[PDB]
Amino acid sequence: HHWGYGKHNGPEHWHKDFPIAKGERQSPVDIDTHTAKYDPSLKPLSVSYDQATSLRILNNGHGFNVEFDDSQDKAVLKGGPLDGTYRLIQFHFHWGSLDGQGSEHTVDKKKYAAELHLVHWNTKYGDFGKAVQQPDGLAVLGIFLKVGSAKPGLQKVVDVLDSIKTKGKSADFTNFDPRGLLPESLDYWTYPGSLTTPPLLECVTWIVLKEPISVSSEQVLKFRKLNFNGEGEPEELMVDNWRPAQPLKNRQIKASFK
């Protein structure tokens, strides 16, 4: 039936409804740090989030999204391997039922507790809908989360989860600053890939940050209390909403650092 992360509707079943699941540039992938090619041509990333305007937080049945006003160049990403300006539209996380799993991408086979994705679309295309149809339509910034000390900037998000426990629930979520989720360093790996949830379109330039951010176990615990189900239905906890690593195939991962 509808895609999900369960035994009968999980990742291994997706290809039946979305054949692209078996495509040539699918994500996520395992980052082999020894075979990644350091590229001197890669410029530094430019993250301009000081004018960012968040509007709402929503439980979509497979995770939660924090949405932003993308009607103007308020929160943009440029530089790095990107040509042009990319507007922030929303961010979401992927996590596990246990601290030893949860991330989509892995580094030398290592899995992190969760992975944050900041989705941006190329302004040359006019709207998100047109952008996903292009090979250079999206730019997604991936950040790993490890369990350790608490991330002060994540608490606002953690506190509002009670309000959107079930599928379809949404809440006002204004004045949230995404800068508080960024690691100290901006060194990264980059490769051409896809969305990790259906429709799985191959329109993404992935920018995966080397440095993980730390969050407390109490913080990730609250993520695990969300529900996949709608109100009044049998409770199914939202855990392990991650897709496993796909074949790299004809692709080379480049590093911005040595």
Binding positions: 92, 94, 117, 196-197
Q: x/- contact string, 71-110, with Zn ion (CB under 5 A)?
A: ----------------------------------------
Binders of Zn ion among 1-60, rule CB under 5 A? none
* Least distance to Zn ion, CB of residue 10, Å: 16
Are 95 and 224 in contact by the 8 Å Cβ rule? The answer is yes
- Residue of 2, 13, 62, 105 with catalytic role: 62
| Residue among 219, 228, 205 nearest 145 (CA) | 219
If the CB atoms of residues 118 and 253 are measured against Zn ion, the closer one turns out to be: 118
Binding residues for substrate: 196-197
If the CB atoms of residues 164 and 208 are measured against Zn ion, the closer one turns out to be: 208
Segment interacting with Zn ion (CB under 5 A) among 18-26, 112-120, 144-152, 213-221: 112-120
Question: What does residue 61 show for φ and ψ, rounded to 5 degrees?
Answer: 95, -20
Query: Residue holding tokens 């996520």?
Result: 28
Peptide bond preceding 28: is omega within 30 degrees of 0, i.e. cis? yes
Are 195 and 203 in contact by the 8 Å Cβ rule? The answer is yes
Peptide bond preceding 199: is omega within 30 degrees of 0, i.e. cis? yes
Rule CB under 5 A: is residue 117 a binding residue for Zn ion?
Answer: yes
Segment interacting with Zn ion (CB under 5 A) among 3-11, 64-72, 117-125, 239-247: 117-125
* Least distance to Zn ion, CB of residue 5, Å: 12
Could you confirm whether 1 is annotated as catalytic? Answer: no
Give residue number: closest CB to Zn ion.
117
* Least distance to Zn ion, CB of residue 196, Å: 5
Rule CB under 5 A: is residue 243 a binding residue for Zn ion?
Answer: no
Q: How many residues bind Zn ion (CB under 5 A)?
A: 1
Residue 222's CB: how many other CB atoms inside 10 A?
A: 17
If the CB atoms of residues 117 and 210 are measured against Zn ion, the closer one turns out to be: 117
* Least distance to Zn ion, CB of residue 34, Å: 26
If the CB atoms of residues 23 and 39 are measured against Zn ion, the closer one turns out to be: 23
Segment interacting with Zn ion (CB under 5 A) among 8-16, 115-123, 210-218, 227-235: 115-123
- Phi-psi map region of 134: left, alpha, beta (phi>0 left; psi -120 to 50 alpha): beta
If the CB atoms of residues 27 and 175 are measured against Zn ion, the closer one turns out to be: 27
Binding residues for Zn(2+): 92, 94, 117
- Report d(CA 202, CA 105) in Å as an integer: 16
Q: Could you list the residues that contact Zn ion (CB under 5 A)?
A: 117
For the annotated catalytic residues, the residue numbers are 62
